[PDB]
Amino acid sequence: FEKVELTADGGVIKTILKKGDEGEENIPKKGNEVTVHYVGKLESTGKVFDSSFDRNVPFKFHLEQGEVIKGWDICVSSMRKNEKCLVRIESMYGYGDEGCGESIPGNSVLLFEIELLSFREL
Numbered sequence: 001f002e003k004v005e006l007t008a009d010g011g012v013i014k015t016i017l018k019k020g021d022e023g024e025e026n027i028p029k030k031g032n033e034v035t036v037h038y039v040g041k042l043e044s045t046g047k048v049f050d051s052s053f054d055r056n057v058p059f060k061f062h063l064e065q066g067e068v069i070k071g072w073d074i075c076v077s078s079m080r081k082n083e084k085c086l087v088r089i090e091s092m093y094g095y096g097d098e099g100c101g102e103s104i105p106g107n108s109v110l111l112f113e114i115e116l117l118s119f120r121e122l
């Protein structure tokens, strides 16, 4: 499995589950609205905290605008259209010491599957 470090400290590590368009490297760019599916779980307890797959509602955000946690901007920036990946995001690139509400404690390593479906620009 194609497995790579997206930050030099190993804080964001991506394993490719299914290769996308690697032949033509069809990759989104900063500012593009991206459409993905995802599932997120805590590495510590294994608890799944969210799944757009189970909702069956694809998730949209603008890439590299700080709309999402840094490890996501870094991860999705590296994905080819139709790629499915597993990404491990250390707390510094996630929610840090604060965590996120009742579902994500402080100092949490996060594991997400992300599937890049589509992207667009105005």
Ligand SMILES: CO[C@H]1C[C@@H]2CC[C@@H](C)[C@@](O)(O2)C(=O)C(=O)N2CCCC[C@H]2C(=O)O[C@H]([C@H](C)C[C@@H]2CC[C@@H](O)[C@H](OC)C2)CC(=O)[C@H](C)/C=C(\C)[C@@H](O)[C@@H](OC)C(=O)[C@H](C)C[C@H](C)/C=C/C=C/C=C/1C
Binding pocket: 038, 040, 049, 050, 059, 060, 061, 066, 067, 068, 069, 070, 072, 100, 103, 104
């Ligand atoms: C119901 O489900 C939520 C998503 C939930 C929230 C809580 C968590 C556990 C989680 O379960 O997703 C989760 O799985 C998670 O950790 N995610 C979601 C998928 C992307 C990665 C991560 C994340 O960054 O969430 C994000 C995290 C929770 C908060 C941000 C982290 C980065 C930091 O820089 C931001 O500060 C600004 C805050 C939430 C989001 O991905 C969304 C889309 C973005 C916003 C809320 C903020 O960026 C915001 O600015 C204020 C905006 O500018 C936006 C686009 C305005 C529009 C109208 C709002 C859309 C809201 C959609 C929210 C929905 C689908």
